[PDB]
Nucleic acid binder design. Structure first.
Ligand SMILES: [Mg+2]
Length: 856
DNA sequence: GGAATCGAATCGCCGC
RNA sequence: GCGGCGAU
DNA sequence: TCGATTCC
């Protein structure tokens, strides 16, 4: 109810504190200091308002218990409630005679769960309905206990395998009513199949539900210090009542956590001065001594950060500080267009005017449900991104602080940042421009080609596309509202950003001062890095590591290989077979048709396999996907949209064709990028052996403990992969879920994506240092595997990003160094089981320097 | 040991 | 944690 | 499905 406004003293500190004002005015003067510290003061003020609205929305809907300010008392109140749940259960079982009316209802539910539900529904009722009456409150337990007892029967006993199917569609429902409707329809379906044992739920009558709840107030008073009973007008049977007795003592305890957590969530804005350079682990970026100091590495534990406190990494610190020094400004011309069309369209480039059936309906019904969520989810940030773009639009320059994740990828810290979407990327441009010149004009035109989606042809055709559309770009730049052509492109606002700079070179010639960031994007960075480590010529050429006759499309290379076997499987290959198969649930044994590869191939050839069929499987390979994961991709990306849109008449049995294509895609991808597949296998074996508590069964003692996986990037950034799992969790059907060990599978399921993402972070960090010290490059646009600068320095960043990768993998065998880190950490019995280093192929890294389409 | 079973990237914002 | 969006 | 991991 009452929240401490924490802004009075500590939010007044950051402006009025001496030392933060001292070191910042010494660099940029007092007046930039007074604005920067007031802007950081504002950022905390917009964030305390962010909490209080969310807290006030939670109390309106009765959602006060799932905040992290109500958690730390709740996590210490359940261990006493469970005892008094048992203690009442142990008081009457020894007494002979009848049960008290509610004893039987309390037993069907897990004694930890009933502890929770009596807590939350009482705070839900009092903070929303303002009524202390037991008739509303004792029913609040009793209705929701009956909800969890009846519908948790599905999750508990008769459908533990079938719940895993219906769990996802229950999660996609939002709100207690919608999850209740779905759980009602599910239960009625199973009783038609006779799944839950055939007994339909006999609903508790009203007088039962109140009796269930008047229990759970009484065990709360004896168990915990929360709520102490109060009796009203005793002796008058007309006026005999008892308050809910919710303790104001504990309401203060959530307020000292509501107020404390409201000061630690700031809405991070950009910087009007260059951000404070990183000299240590905390403190910089933003200049003030705030309640939330920026961390150099965004770790999930404070211990994980403290290992970084002493490690000597001069080149990591150099690379972040150079990146922070890039002066950005808001593209005023792009913002003028964006300020107009967003007032008319929810997404300004969305709908431009231009020239077994029950499960298909249910798929279409869920489509508008998700798109209604999607439309609300995309418009609220677009309004915010426009506000932040409009706020700093008149500033001569703004700056973005930078820190890193726990693997070493570089992230801008402000919520408005160059790392956002196309509109935000188009709304931002560099401030320190140069005369564009001949080379800058050429690379500006190339940057224009990639904004329009023309990135699959060589540079002369990319140059040619811009020149043929000269009158289209000029008419778009002269008036962007009379010509929608820029909005039709792949990157619309960034293309319009190119359109104005192209117009400036047309008006002012090659002496035009241009500061547009010209991005260069690595094709598939993980596969690019994996092929470079093991020197795969065939894999490297597929992601343009090598000079090729044209741009190489790794999605279409796989699709060509799939269509090769598809036409081979149309001539030879298995015929259709009849196989006996049983559904495990009904037990019924049926004799269905299993299509041979001959009939399966002719189905796919009727559909037509292009790079759209195999795109997602290649993209998710570096994330760990393999032949099984491709099957649900093929069914979701290709097969089901075909059936819904009139095609799929070939796909008589969709799950058979999805697993057939997944077999073919994996056969093609794992044979095209060989070094990628082998490298993730080696890393997975390493994290598997490191994360075992390997012990002898007879002695029972662990010879070697669970061990985390750790490596060092060639830049000098160290990484610690330590996924940790909790001991016990509780899951409620209608309501929300409530020491540690090493989560061994997450260690295996993360080692190869995190390592190659750590590798492209060191590649990025070495690139911005090499471009800034060997060349004069001072402005940087950095999206993980994307490299951007002003057009005059574009040719050097083009040359520098190739130089660092060539030098790094020539100077560092990052796989063999990774072996040297963990090898002394192995148990004997695992040492024989560790596979050897994957071999080195015939690729020469010096070819990368002349690779036109690596971009990185 | 042996079924019984489980499982098949990071980061941000918003909402429950 | 779950639902949705965006970035790689 | 194919392998690990997990309770037993
Ligand atoms: Mg594209």
């Amino acid at each position: 109810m009452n929240t401490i406004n924490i802004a009075k003293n500590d939010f007044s500190d950051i402006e009025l504190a001496a030392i933060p004002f001292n070191t910042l005015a010494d660099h940029y003067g007092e007046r930039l200091a007074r604005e920067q510290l007031a802007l950081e003061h504002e950022s905390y003020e917009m964030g305390e308002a962010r909490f209080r609205k969310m807290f006030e929305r939670q109390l309106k809907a009765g959602e006060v218990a799932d905040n992290a300010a109500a958690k730390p008392l709740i996590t210490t109140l359940l261990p006493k409630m469970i005892a008094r749940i048992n203690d009442w259960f142990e008081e009457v079982k020894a007494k002979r005679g009848k049960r008290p009316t509610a004893f039987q209802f309390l037993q069907e539910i897990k004694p930890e769960a009933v502890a929770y539900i009596t807590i939350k529904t009482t705070l839900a009722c009092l903070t929303s309905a303002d009524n202390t009456t037991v008739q509303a409150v004792a029913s609040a337990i009793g209705r929701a206990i009956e909800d969890e007892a009846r519908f948790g029967r599905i999750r508990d006993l008769e459908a533990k395998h079938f719940k895993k199917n219906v769990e996802e569609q229950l999660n996609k429902r939002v709100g207690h009513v919608y999850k209740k409707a779905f759980m009602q329809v599910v239960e009625a379906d199973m009783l038609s199949k006779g799944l839950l044992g055939g007994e339909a739920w006999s609903s508790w009558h009203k007088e039962d539900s109140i009796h269930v709840g008047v229990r759970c107030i009484e065990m709360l008073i004896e168990s915990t210090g929360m709520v102490s009973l109060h009796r009203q007008n005793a002796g008058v049977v007309g006026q005999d009542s008892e308050t809910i007795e919710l303790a104001p003592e504990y309401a203060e305890a959530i307020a000292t956590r509501a107020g404390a957590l409201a000061g630690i969530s700031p809405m991070f804005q950009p910087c009007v001065v260059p951000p404070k350079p990183w000299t240590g682990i905390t403190g910089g970026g933003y200049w003030a001594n705030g309640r939330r100091p920026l961390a150099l590495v965004r770790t999930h534990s404070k211990k994980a950060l403290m290992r970084y406190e002493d490690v000597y990494m001069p080149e990591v610190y150099k690379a972040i500080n150079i990146a922070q020094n890039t002066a950005w400004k808001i593209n005023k011309k792009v913002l003028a267009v964006a300020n107009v069309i967003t007032k008319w369209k929810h997404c300004p480039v969305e709908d431009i005017p231009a020239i077994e059936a029950l499960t298909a309906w249910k798929r279409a019904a869920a489509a508008v449900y998700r798109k209604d969520k999607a439309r609300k989810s995309r418009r609220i940030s677009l309004e915010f991104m426009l506000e932040q773009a409009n706020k700093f639009a008149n500033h001569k320059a703004i700056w973005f602080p930078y820190n890193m994740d726990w693997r070493g990828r570089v992230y801008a810290v402000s919520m408005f940042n160059p790392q956002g979407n196309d509109m935000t990327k188009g709304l931002l441009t560099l401030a320190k421009g140069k005369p564009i010149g001949k080379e800058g004009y050429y690379w500006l035109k190339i940057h224009g080609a990639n904004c329009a989606g023309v990135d699959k042809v060589p540079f002369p055709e990319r140059i040619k596309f811009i020149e043929e559309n000269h009158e289209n770009i000029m008419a778009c730049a002269k008036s962007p509202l009379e010509n929608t052509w820029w909005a039709e492109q792949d990157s619309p606002f960034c293309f319009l950003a190119f359109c104005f700079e192209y117009a400036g070179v047309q008006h002012h010639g090659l002496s035009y001062n241009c500061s547009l960031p010209l991005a260069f994007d690595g094709s598939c960075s993980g596969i690019q890095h994996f092929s470079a480590m093991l020197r795969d010529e065939v894999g490297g050429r597929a992601v343009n590591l090598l000079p090729s006759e044209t741009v190489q499309d790794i999605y279409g290379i796989v699709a060509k290989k799939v269509n090769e076997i598809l036409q081979a499987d149309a001539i030879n290959g298995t015929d259709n077979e009849v196989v006996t198969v049983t559904d495990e649930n009904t037990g019924e044994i049926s004799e269905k048709v299993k299509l041979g590869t001959k009939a399966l191939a002719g189905q796919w050839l009727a559909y037509g396999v292009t790079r759209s069929v195999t795109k997602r499987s290649v993209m998710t390979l570096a994330y760990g996907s393999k032949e099984f994961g491709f099957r649900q991709q093929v069914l979701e990306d290709t097969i089901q949209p075909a059936i819904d849109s009139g095609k799929g008449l070939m796909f008589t049995q969709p799950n058979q064709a999805a697993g057939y294509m997944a077999k073919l895609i994996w056969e093609s991808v794992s044979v095209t990028v060989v070094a990628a597949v082998e490298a993730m296998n080696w890393l997975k074996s390493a994290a598997k052996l490191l994360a075992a508590e390997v012990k002898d069964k007879k002695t029972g003692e662990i010879l070697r403990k669970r061990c985390a996986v750790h490596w060092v990037t060639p830049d000098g950034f160290p990484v610690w992969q330590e996924y940790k799992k909790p001991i016990q969790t509780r899951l409620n059907l209608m309501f929300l879920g409530q020491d540690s060990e090493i989560d061994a599978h997450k260690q295996e399921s993360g080692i190869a994506p995190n390592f190659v993402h750590s590798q492209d972070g060191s590649h990025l960090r070495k690139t911005v240092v090499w471009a800034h010290e060997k060349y004069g490059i001072e402005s940087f646009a950095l999206i993980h595997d994307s490299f951007g600068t002003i057009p005059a320095d574009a040719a050097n960043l083009f040359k520098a990003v190739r130089e660092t990768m060539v030098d790094t993998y020539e100077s560092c065998d990052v796989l063999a160094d990774f072996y040297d880190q963990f090898a002394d950490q192995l148990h004997e019995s695992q040492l024989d089981k560790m596979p050897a280093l994957p071999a080195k192929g015939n690729l020469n890294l010096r070819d990368i320097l002349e690779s036109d389409f690596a971009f990185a």
